[PDB]
Curated annotation (Swiss-Prot):
It comes from Ureaplasma parvum serovar 3 (strain ATCC 700970). This is Uncharacterized protein UU089.1. To Synechocystis PCC 6803 slr1025.
Length: 79
């Protein structure tokens, strides 16, 4: 599906993460260190640029994300 560099297009933007178990746009592993991107998780579904289907995995992700509260590469509303 999508590749590692896709999320780079949403610098200082906000996207919607749709949790799925099959056919995802991105397999995502959440990490506490050394991510590919830092993501601020949002409590509002407002202003989402686009909807990206993610599958949470623990091995072989497309991208490693680190949840942060400040200074994030982009924002995400998870549904």
């Amino acid at each position: 599906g999508y590749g590692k560099g896709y999320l780079a297009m949403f610098k200082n933007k906000k996207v919607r993460f749709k949790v799925v178990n099959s056919f995802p746009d991105l397999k995502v592993q959440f990490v506490t260190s050394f991510p590919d991107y830092k993501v601020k998780i949002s409590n509002s579904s407002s202003f989402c640029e686009e909807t990206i289907k993610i599958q949470v995995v623990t091995s072989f992700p497309d991208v490693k994300l680190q949840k942060v509260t400040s200074f994030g590469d982009f924002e995400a509303y998870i549904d």
